[PDB]
Motif scaffolding. Structure first.
Motif, PDB file in Angstrom:
ATOM      1  N   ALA D 170      -5.341 -24.338  36.340  1.00 12.42           N
ATOM      2  CA  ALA D 170      -4.636 -25.219  35.417  1.00 12.42           C
ATOM      3  C   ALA D 170      -4.741 -24.712  33.986  1.00 12.42           C
ATOM      4  O   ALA D 170      -3.754 -24.726  33.239  1.00 12.42           O
ATOM      5  CB  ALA D 170      -5.189 -26.640  35.527  1.00 12.42           C
ATOM      6  N   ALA D 171      -5.932 -24.263  33.582  1.00 12.07           N
ATOM      7  CA  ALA D 171      -6.096 -23.725  32.237  1.00 12.07           C
ATOM      8  C   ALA D 171      -5.240 -22.482  32.037  1.00 12.07           C
ATOM      9  O   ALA D 171      -4.628 -22.303  30.979  1.00 12.07           O
ATOM     10  CB  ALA D 171      -7.568 -23.412  31.973  1.00 12.07           C
ATOM     11  N   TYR D 172      -5.187 -21.609  33.046  1.00 13.11           N
ATOM     12  CA  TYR D 172      -4.359 -20.413  32.954  1.00 13.11           C
ATOM     13  C   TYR D 172      -2.886 -20.774  32.824  1.00 13.11           C
ATOM     14  O   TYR D 172      -2.159 -20.175  32.022  1.00 13.11           O
ATOM     15  CB  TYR D 172      -4.591 -19.530  34.180  1.00 13.11           C
ATOM     16  CG  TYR D 172      -3.834 -18.223  34.161  1.00 13.11           C
ATOM     17  CD1 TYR D 172      -4.242 -17.172  33.350  1.00 13.11           C
ATOM     18  CD2 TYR D 172      -2.715 -18.036  34.961  1.00 13.11           C
ATOM     19  CE1 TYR D 172      -3.554 -15.975  33.333  1.00 13.11           C
ATOM     20  CE2 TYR D 172      -2.020 -16.841  34.951  1.00 13.11           C
ATOM     21  CZ  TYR D 172      -2.445 -15.814  34.135  1.00 13.11           C
ATOM     22  OH  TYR D 172      -1.756 -14.623  34.121  1.00 13.11           O
ATOM     23  N   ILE D 173      -2.426 -21.753  33.605  1.00 11.86           N
ATOM     24  CA  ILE D 173      -1.029 -22.174  33.526  1.00 11.86           C
ATOM     25  C   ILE D 173      -0.722 -22.729  32.142  1.00 11.86           C
ATOM     26  O   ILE D 173       0.311 -22.408  31.541  1.00 11.86           O
ATOM     27  CB  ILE D 173      -0.719 -23.204  34.628  1.00 11.86           C
ATOM     28  CG1 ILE D 173      -0.795 -22.551  36.012  1.00 11.86           C
ATOM     29  CG2 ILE D 173       0.651 -23.830  34.403  1.00 11.86           C
ATOM     30  CD1 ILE D 173       0.424 -21.733  36.378  1.00 11.86           C
ATOM     31  N   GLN D 174      -1.611 -23.576  31.618  1.00  9.02           N
ATOM     32  CA  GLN D 174      -1.389 -24.151  30.295  1.00  9.02           C
ATOM     33  C   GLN D 174      -1.357 -23.067  29.225  1.00  9.02           C
ATOM     34  O   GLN D 174      -0.505 -23.092  28.330  1.00  9.02           O
ATOM     35  CB  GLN D 174      -2.473 -25.183  29.986  1.00  9.02           C
ATOM     36  CG  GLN D 174      -2.533 -25.606  28.525  1.00  9.02           C
ATOM     37  CD  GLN D 174      -3.383 -26.842  28.311  1.00  9.02           C
ATOM     38  OE1 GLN D 174      -4.013 -27.345  29.241  1.00  9.02           O
ATOM     39  NE2 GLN D 174      -3.408 -27.337  27.080  1.00  9.02           N
ATOM     40  N   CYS D 175      -2.281 -22.105  29.301  1.00 12.64           N
ATOM     41  CA  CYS D 175      -2.304 -21.026  28.321  1.00 12.64           C
ATOM     42  C   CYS D 175      -1.035 -20.187  28.398  1.00 12.64           C
ATOM     43  O   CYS D 175      -0.461 -19.820  27.366  1.00 12.64           O
ATOM     44  CB  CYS D 175      -3.538 -20.149  28.535  1.00 12.64           C
ATOM     45  SG  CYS D 175      -4.913 -20.521  27.422  1.00 12.64           S
ATOM     46  N   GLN D 176      -0.581 -19.871  29.613  1.00 12.65           N
ATOM     47  CA  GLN D 176       0.641 -19.090  29.761  1.00 12.65           C
ATOM     48  C   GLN D 176       1.840 -19.837  29.192  1.00 12.65           C
ATOM     49  O   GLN D 176       2.684 -19.245  28.509  1.00 12.65           O
ATOM     50  CB  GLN D 176       0.874 -18.749  31.233  1.00 12.65           C
ATOM     51  CG  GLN D 176      -0.240 -17.930  31.863  1.00 12.65           C
ATOM     52  CD  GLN D 176       0.219 -16.545  32.274  1.00 12.65           C
ATOM     53  OE1 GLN D 176       1.125 -16.397  33.094  1.00 12.65           O
ATOM     54  NE2 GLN D 176      -0.405 -15.521  31.704  1.00 12.65           N
ATOM     55  N   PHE D 177       1.934 -21.140  29.463  1.00  8.40           N
ATOM     56  CA  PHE D 177       3.053 -21.916  28.937  1.00  8.40           C
ATOM     57  C   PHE D 177       3.003 -21.997  27.415  1.00  8.40           C
ATOM     58  O   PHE D 177       4.043 -21.922  26.751  1.00  8.40           O
ATOM     59  CB  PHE D 177       3.060 -23.314  29.552  1.00  8.40           C
ATOM     60  CG  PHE D 177       3.997 -23.454  30.716  1.00  8.40           C
ATOM     61  CD1 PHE D 177       5.348 -23.676  30.510  1.00  8.40           C
ATOM     62  CD2 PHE D 177       3.530 -23.354  32.015  1.00  8.40           C
ATOM     63  CE1 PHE D 177       6.214 -23.800  31.577  1.00  8.40           C
ATOM     64  CE2 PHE D 177       4.391 -23.477  33.087  1.00  8.40           C
ATOM     65  CZ  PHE D 177       5.735 -23.701  32.867  1.00  8.40           C
ATOM     66  N   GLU D 178       1.806 -22.151  26.845  1.00 10.04           N
ATOM     67  CA  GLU D 178       1.692 -22.255  25.394  1.00 10.04           C
ATOM     68  C   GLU D 178       1.936 -20.917  24.708  1.00 10.04           C
ATOM     69  O   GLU D 178       2.373 -20.886  23.552  1.00 10.04           O
ATOM     70  CB  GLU D 178       0.315 -22.801  25.016  1.00 10.04           C
ATOM     71  CG  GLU D 178       0.179 -24.304  25.190  1.00 10.04           C
ATOM     72  CD  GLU D 178      -1.166 -24.827  24.725  1.00 10.04           C
ATOM     73  OE1 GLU D 178      -2.148 -24.709  25.488  1.00 10.04           O
ATOM     74  OE2 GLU D 178      -1.241 -25.355  23.596  1.00 10.04           O
ATOM     75  N   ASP D 179       1.660 -19.806  25.395  1.00  3.22           N
ATOM     76  CA  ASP D 179       1.856 -18.492  24.790  1.00  3.22           C
ATOM     77  C   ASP D 179       3.315 -18.224  24.449  1.00  3.22           C
ATOM     78  O   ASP D 179       3.592 -17.390  23.580  1.00  3.22           O
ATOM     79  CB  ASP D 179       1.335 -17.402  25.728  1.00  3.22           C
ATOM     80  CG  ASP D 179      -0.177 -17.277  25.697  1.00  3.22           C
ATOM     81  OD1 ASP D 179      -0.819 -17.978  24.888  1.00  3.22           O
ATOM     82  OD2 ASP D 179      -0.723 -16.474  26.484  1.00  3.22           O
ATOM     83  N   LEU D 180       4.254 -18.906  25.109  1.00  5.59           N
ATOM     84  CA  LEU D 180       5.667 -18.687  24.824  1.00  5.59           C
ATOM     85  C   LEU D 180       6.044 -19.106  23.410  1.00  5.59           C
ATOM     86  O   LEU D 180       7.100 -18.698  22.917  1.00  5.59           O
ATOM     87  CB  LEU D 180       6.531 -19.449  25.831  1.00  5.59           C
ATOM     88  CG  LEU D 180       6.336 -19.114  27.310  1.00  5.59           C
ATOM     89  CD1 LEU D 180       7.440 -19.756  28.135  1.00  5.59           C
ATOM     90  CD2 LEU D 180       6.300 -17.610  27.541  1.00  5.59           C
ATOM     91  N   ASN D 181       5.212 -19.905  22.750  1.00  8.61           N
ATOM     92  CA  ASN D 181       5.510 -20.387  21.404  1.00  8.61           C
ATOM     93  C   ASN D 181       5.385 -19.229  20.424  1.00  8.61           C
ATOM     94  O   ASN D 181       4.283 -18.853  20.021  1.00  8.61           O
ATOM     95  CB  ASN D 181       4.570 -21.528  21.029  1.00  8.61           C
ATOM     96  CG  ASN D 181       4.967 -22.208  19.734  1.00  8.61           C
ATOM     97  OD1 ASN D 181       5.970 -21.854  19.116  1.00  8.61           O
ATOM     98  ND2 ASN D 181       4.179 -23.191  19.318  1.00  8.61           N
ATOM     99  N   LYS D 182       6.522 -18.656  20.037  1.00 13.20           N
ATOM    100  CA  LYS D 182       6.560 -17.574  19.063  1.00 13.20           C
ATOM    101  C   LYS D 182       6.618 -18.078  17.627  1.00 13.20           C
ATOM    102  O   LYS D 182       6.634 -17.261  16.700  1.00 13.20           O
ATOM    103  CB  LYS D 182       7.765 -16.664  19.334  1.00 13.20           C
ATOM    104  CG  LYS D 182       7.788 -16.023  20.722  1.00 13.20           C
ATOM    105  CD  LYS D 182       6.444 -15.423  21.130  1.00 13.20           C
ATOM    106  CE  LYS D 182       5.965 -14.360  20.150  1.00 13.20           C
ATOM    107  NZ  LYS D 182       4.578 -13.909  20.454  1.00 13.20           N
TER     108      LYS D 182
END
Ligand SMILES: NCCc1c[nH]c2ccc(C(N)=O)cc12
Lengths: 274, 233, 342, 224, 55
Positions: D170-182
């Motif tokens: 879950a933490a990995y998924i959240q981090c991956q989704f948040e990383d899209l914020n350029k």
């Protein structure tokens, strides 16, 4: 005594003030995007700075060119004193009103909506102007020492301690405390919100600190000296009084820099105009 | 459907007072301004009072000013005329008229039945050519009228209104602005005019067309109705 | 294979049509209109400023009388303005505030509007009751409506985001005809002066001229690069202008069956939002995303003038039926009517 | 002006007053976009808040009103109509955690999670939403936990460390989704895991809206 | 292959139109524009007396 350099610097300061304040006022009055509630306080502050630079600062410089002597008209000396006091108080209370508006928006965004915000800002501006006028016109009716009895050889604000303490308290000390409290609360709220980035906290802290430091450095010395003198036999020298008065004047120059230079809309409009 | 029902009237002692109440239904009452028009026994129409939408503007006739007051209650869709110091000349049948004002509008399009009121015991003048004229089916008739002041405003609109009253019925709007036929009116009628002289023509007369024709000017208050012309079969 | 044969036949037909268009291009409009007298610097001023909309104004239309105007904004209110006296006539509260197009009937009795709700609402302005109410709701479109145009008091043609157009009978509320053939979203419509033909531009970088009675695509026109947003018929009716996201306008002629003139400038790098001609067709007025509108010489393609008085992009443009004045509406919620001076 | 002209002016003034009143009333409502894919467990979210074309849902919290627009049924090029939502206070994005091993119906190899990531990147890195915040909801917590117990997350994330556990995944998924914020400097993402408690989700949405409003006001003061 | 059949049919149908030479179409468009220019308020501003949108 570095008279030429001092005169050149003072003239440059006067020109910079006049130009920047007039530019800000024109930007408010011309661009329709700026026709919003938060900009009315900025417009009032710009008007106060324009009055300071047009009516107060030139006459003060002319008077200081001859030293402590006064050669202008009898009624014009009272007019100049009243204008100086009114404009300084108006600028100080306009800064206080801007700080209060920021605090209300940050803390009471729910109850400080546009409907409430418009009325609150208008009332604040009206009270600022009324209080400044009252404080400026009080010495003409109360106290003494407005002008020297030797043929109006001197021109100064009333030195009556009873009036002096009241004027100093109403004009600066109370708004100073209000500004300090509201800005401390604003800084605490901003820190809490950011905590819930480092560059971000640094930006907020730098803004608050520079604003408060500029205000304090420009105003506190002059008001402290003016309150201390009537109660002292200390007899502070006139050079320090002139330096503190011109620092209080330079507060007018610094205000547009603090309130418009670092504002996105203001700097964007200035760049577009250029 | 659109309907206006007036109430109040009957016998009143001279110098008395009473409130006439009109109920409106079938349309947005709050969007329509209201007028009171009184017709004395065997006499022409006469404007009494006017209240605009939202009660923002109120007007009275000089014979009505002060004595009678007009009000409206939008939520209940009601109109009130409180009359005091009722003179003997106030006896008449009172009608409530709706009016809507906007570009292309046709005010005075609907008239109420009205109620009878009886007692115990500086403006534009409109005139008509004749009191009555003969009529037969299939014939063409032309009623004529004139006004003291030209009704052609600078905007280019001539404020003239033609109303037809049937025997035992309230008047109805035929033509508004001297050039626009009222909605639902048969195409037989046709109004025309210039400045101060106006005429209403009927291409082919019908048996129903017989009735009392009135002319009205809306250029400026008070609204004056000319003497009716009786079109008799 | 049958599919390969069909593809080869389609390619051969494309080659044949392009070759025919090349052959019939014996000359160009620029050479013929080279010696025409330049129109000159066209100067216009904002005679009236209509305000009251509290959100982006997305569409507007002129009445046949050339005096009444209709405007639609995302605020949720459709406003009928009296242009001569800048007086509001009607304020219709819209059930759905997501409206992107509006129309005014030629007779002025009905007003049509639509948008992301996928429903074209028709309002009757001349009811016995003194309020405006919905008379019909045309539903059935699978995508958001983009344009609305009244053929008459009973027939209305509407284009939607489902890459199809439709002719509806208002009385029955049923799609009398469906126009298909566009591979992309349809963005605009323009009735021919004869009212029998219309042309629709789509996001596939192409326009299609259809037949109302026969319900068929008579012609297709290409030449745009990215996306066509606006389209308008030339007053004579044998030509139409198209504005696209390519920041250039293109004039097409139905009889020629190919592009005639291209309007572009190095100073414009933003797409075209709206297009309209003057009564004589000499002036081609196109709204641009760069907070201003431009006027082009329809014959010489010279930039006659600029109508720059909007704080935001010009979303809608319209010219009165008589051509007396030209109205522009922008996202800043202000509608401005511009007219020339002697 | 004539009497009819004066009456028309009065009518125009009344219309202007009504328009001003309606605008003042509407200015008090928070506008929120709603987006997702694969139904993103979106029905549950909308019915929690409440308790063809766009669907508008109005729900009032303890002290604030909220308007939510479901435009996910439009099914058309977002480029031509997304700009209509420039003024939305925030954009609620819904993602089903179970999509990692699910294959898109329109495809045969691409996972639904990849499509959701692409949609999130498109919406977030949009010129119309540079300064607009995003509230991210992860709906299928229980079903995702059940799936990961048997299907490794590496099926969708080859770069993943391979730790087959709920919390780390879950933490990995959240981090991956948040990383899209350029545009992290201009916008923030308020990730949250959906739960059966409706009040918790509504409270989180209200808190996110309040934080966004406070940050916007402070930026108005220039501190940001 | 129904879509391909429809595409080829539409192409064959459209390719048979009797398109007119570009020069002739331009000539008629120019003639119409020249004829109707006199009746263009925008191209030729009308006197303020005849302009409804007075200041
Ligand atoms: N230039 C300073 C004018 C002023 C503003 N507030 C004051 C308050 C007190 C005195 C004074 N001279 O006592 C002067 C001022």
């Amino acid at each position: 005594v570095f008279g030429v350099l001092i005169l050149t610097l003072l003239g440059f300061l006067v020109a910079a003030t006049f130009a920047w304040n007039l530019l800000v006022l024109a930007t408010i009055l011309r661009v329709r995007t700026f026709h919003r509630v938060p900009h009315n306080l900025v417009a009032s502050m710009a008007v106060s700075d324009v009055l300071v630079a047009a009516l107060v600062m030139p006459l003060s410089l002319v008077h200081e060119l001859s030293g402590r002597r006064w050669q202008l008209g009898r009624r014009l000396c009272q007019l100049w004193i009243a204008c100086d006091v009114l404009c300084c108080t108006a600028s100080i209370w306009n800064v206080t009103a801007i700080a209060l508006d920021r605090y209300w928006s940050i803390t009471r965004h729910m109850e400080y909506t546009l409907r409430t915000r418009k009325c609150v800002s208008n009332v604040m501006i009206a009270l600022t102007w009324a209080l400044s006028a009252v404080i400026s016109l009080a010495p003409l009716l109360f106290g003494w020492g407005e002008t020297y009895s030797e043929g109006s050889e001197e021109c100064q604000v009333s030195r009556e301690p009873s009036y002096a303490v009241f004027s100093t308290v109403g004009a600066f000390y109370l708004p100073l405390c209000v500004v300090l409290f509201v800005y401390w609360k604003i800084y605490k709220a901003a820190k809490f919100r950011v905590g819930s980035r480092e560059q971000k906290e640094q930006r907020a802290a730098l803004m608050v600190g520079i604003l408060i430091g500029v205000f304090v450095l420009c105003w506190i010395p002059f008001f402290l000296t003016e309150l201390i003198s009537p109660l002292c036999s200390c007899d502070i020298p006139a050079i320090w009084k002139s330096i503190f008065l011109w620092l209080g004047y330079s507060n007018s120059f610094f205000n547009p820099l603090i309130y418009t230079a670092f504002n996105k809309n203001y700097n964007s409009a200035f760049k577009n105009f250029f | 459907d659109v309907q206006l029902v007036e109430s109040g009237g009957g016998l009143v002692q001279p110098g008395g007072s009473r409130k006439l109440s009109c109920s409106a239904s079938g349309f947005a009452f709050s969007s329509f301004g209201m007028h009171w028009v009184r017709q004395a026994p065997e006499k022409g129409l006469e404007w009494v009072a006017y209240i605009s939408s939202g009660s923002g503007t109120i007007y009275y006739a000089d014979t009505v000013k002060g004595r009678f007051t007009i009000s409206r209650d939008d939520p209940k869709n009601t109109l009130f005329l409180q009359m005091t110091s009722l003179r003997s000349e106030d006896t008449a049948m009172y009608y409530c008229v709706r009016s809507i004002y906007y570009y292309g509008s046709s005010p005075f399009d609907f008239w109420g039945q009205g109620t009878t009121l009886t007692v115990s015991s500086s403006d534009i003048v409109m005139t008509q050519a004749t009191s009555s004229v003969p009529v037969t089916p299939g014939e063409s008739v032309s009623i004529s009228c004139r006004s003291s002041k030209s009704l052609l405003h600078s905007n280019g609109n001539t404020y003239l209104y033609w109303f037809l009253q049937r025997p035992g019925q309230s008047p109805q709007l035929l033509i508004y602005r001297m050039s626009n036929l009222a909605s639902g009116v048969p195409d037989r009628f046709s109004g025309s005019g210039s400045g101060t002289a106006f005429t209403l023509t009927i291409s082919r007369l019908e048996a129903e067309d017989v009735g009392v024709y009135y002319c009205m000017q809306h250029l400026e208050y008070p609204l004056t109705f000319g003497a009716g012309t009786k079109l008799e079969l | 294979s049958e599919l390969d044969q069909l593809r080869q036949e389609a390619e051969q037909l494309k080659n044949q049509i392009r070759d025919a268009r090349k052959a019939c291009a014996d000359a160009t409009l620029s050479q013929i209109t080279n010696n025409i007298d330049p129109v000159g610097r066209i100067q216009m001023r904002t005679r009236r400023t209509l305000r009251g909309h509290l959100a982006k104004i997305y569409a507007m239309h002129w009445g046949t009388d050339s005096r009444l105007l209709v405007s639609a904004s995302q605020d949720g209110k459709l406003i009928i303005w009296d242009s001569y006296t800048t007086n509001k006539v009607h304020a219709i509260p819209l059930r759905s505030s997501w409206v992107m197009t509006c129309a005014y009937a030629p007779s002025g009795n009905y007003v049509a509007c639509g948008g992301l709700d996928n429903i074209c609402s028709i309002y009757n302005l001349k009811t016995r009751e003194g309020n405006v109410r919905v008379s019909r709701e045309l539903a059935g479109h699978t995508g958001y409506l983009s344009c609305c145009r009244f053929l008459d008091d009973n027939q209305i043609v509407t284009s939607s985001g489902d890459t199809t157009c439709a002719l509806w009978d208002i009385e029955t509320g049923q799609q009398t005809t469906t126009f298909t053939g566009h591979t992309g979203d349809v963005m605009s419509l323009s009735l021919a002066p004869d009212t029998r033909l219309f042309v629709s531009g789509a996001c596939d970088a192409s326009a299609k001229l259809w037949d109302v009675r026969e319900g068929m695509c008579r012609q297709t026109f290409t030449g745009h690069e990215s996306d066509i947003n606006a389209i308008c018929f030339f007053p004579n009716g044998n030509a139409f202008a198209t504005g696209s996201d390519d920041a250039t306008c293109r004039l097409f002629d139905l009889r020629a069956d190919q592009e005639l003139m291209t309007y572009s400038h190095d100073n414009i790098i933003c797409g075209i939002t709206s297009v309209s001609f003057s009564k004589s067709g000499r002036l081609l007025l196109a709204g641009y995303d760069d907070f201003n509108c431009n006027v082009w010489d329809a014959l010489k393609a010279d930039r006659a003038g600029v109508l720059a008085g909007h704080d935001n992009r010009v979303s809608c443009l319209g010219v009165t039926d008589d051509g007396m004045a030209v109205a522009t509406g922008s996202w800043d919620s202000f509608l401005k009517i511009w007219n020339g001076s002697s | 002006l004539s009497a009819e002209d004066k009456a028309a002016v009065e009518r125009s003034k009344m219309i202007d007053r009504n328009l001003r009143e309606d605008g003042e009333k509407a200015a008090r409502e928070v506008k929120l976009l709603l987006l997702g894919a694969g139904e993103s467990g979106k029905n549950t979210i909308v019915k929690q808040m409440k308790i063809t074309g766009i669907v508008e849902t109005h729900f009032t919290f303890k002290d604030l009103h909220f308007k939510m627009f479901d435009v996910g049924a439009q099914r058309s090029e977002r480029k031509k109509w997304i700009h209509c939502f420039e003024g939305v206070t925030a954009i609620i994005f819904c993602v089903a955690l179970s999509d990692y091993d699910l294959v898109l119906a329109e495809d045969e190899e691409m996972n639904r999670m990849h499509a959701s990531m692409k949609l999130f990147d498109s919406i977030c890195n949009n010129k119309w939403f540079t300064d607009t915040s995003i509230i991210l909801f992860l709906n299928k917590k229980d079903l995702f936990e059940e799936k990961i117990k048997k299907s490794p997350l590496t099926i969708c994330y080859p770069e993943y460390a391979g730790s087959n556990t709920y919390e780390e995944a879950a933490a990995y998924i959240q981090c991956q989704f948040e990383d899209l914020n350029k545009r992290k400097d201009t916008k923030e993402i308020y990730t949250h895991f959906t739960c059966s408690t409706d009040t918790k989700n509504v409270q989180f949405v209200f808190d996110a809206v309040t934080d966004v409003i406070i940050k916007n006001n402070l930026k108005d003061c220039g501190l940001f | 292959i129904a879509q391909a059949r429809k595409l080829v049919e539409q192409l064959k149908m459209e390719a048979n139109i009797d398109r007119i030479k570009v020069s002739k179409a331009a000539a008629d468009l120019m003639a119409y524009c020249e004829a109707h220019a006199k009746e263009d308020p925008l191209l030729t501003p009308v006197p303020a007396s005849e302009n409804p949108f007075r200041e």
